[PDB]
Amino acid sequence: MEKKTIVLGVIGSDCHAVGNKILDHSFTNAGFNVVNIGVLSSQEDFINAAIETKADLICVSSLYGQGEIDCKGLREKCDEAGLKGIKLFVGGNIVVGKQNWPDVEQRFKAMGFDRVYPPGTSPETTIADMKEVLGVE
Numbered sequence: 001m002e003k004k005t006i007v008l009g010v011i012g013s014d015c016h017a018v019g020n021k022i023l024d025h026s027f028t029n030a031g032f033n034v035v036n037i038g039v040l041s042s043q044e045d046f047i048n049a050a051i052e053t054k055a056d057l058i059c060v061s062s063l064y065g066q067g068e069i070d071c072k073g074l075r076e077k078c079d080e081a082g083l084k085g086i087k088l089f090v091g092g093n094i095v096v097g098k099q100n101w102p103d104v105e106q107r108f109k110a111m112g113f114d115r116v117y118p119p120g121t122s123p124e125t126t127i128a129d130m131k132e133v134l135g136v137e
Contacts, residue, residue, distance in 0.1 A: 001087070002134055003056035007035040007046060012065035019061020019091055023126050030130030032056065041066040043073045047083060055085050057133055063092030063119060071104075075111055087133050088114035095119050113137075 006027050011019045017039060027034050035053045037046055046055070058074055060066055066073075070090075077083045093116040094101060101109060108114070115132070117125050 001056070003054055003084070004031065004033040005035055005053045005056040006030070006032050006059060006130075007037060007050070007053070007055045007057075008059040008061065009037040009039055010041055010060045010062040010066055010070075011039055012062055017061060021061075021123055023059050023061070023091065023123065023129065025123065026126035026129045029127055030134060032130065041070055043069045047073075047077065050077070050083055050085060057087035057089060057130075058085060059129065060088075060090045060093060063095050065092075071108070074114065075108060078111065078113070086113045089117070089129055089133055090114050091117045091121070092119060 006024070008020075008023055011017045020036075024034055024036055033053065035046075035049075035055060042049075049055075058070075060070060074085050074088045077085045093114075094104065098116070098118045105112070
């Protein structure tokens with residue numbers, strides 16, 4: 001929970017990475033470690049490196065630009081009950097929704113250990129990245 005490990009990346013077509021947008025600065029604001037992959041959706045590949053670095057949380061810079069891979073990727077990592085990564089502050093993740101998610105995160109509402117930053121947030125919300133996840137939920 002206070003593990004120094006933040007694996008960040010993804011994003012689709014949007015300049016380059018307006019998510020990169022120093023969410024890694026929040027690393028510093030968490031006294032955590034950096035595990036920037038890039039703009040890939042390395043599931044089972046960075047899951048092998050999630051044992052390595054010991055990914056505490058995952059920060060996606062995409063509102064579904066990772067598929068059902070990253071969706072039931074970390075949910076499967078919970079359901080793994082071996083790989084630690086039950087904290088997923090998934091930036092963007094599904095547009096036109098906040099709290100009230102469709103049938104998709106209806107089942108992942110029950111899980112709902114993953115929060116999302118609504119489209120139109122700020123890096124001010126990333127100060128709140130590791131403020132809530134490290135604090136209490």
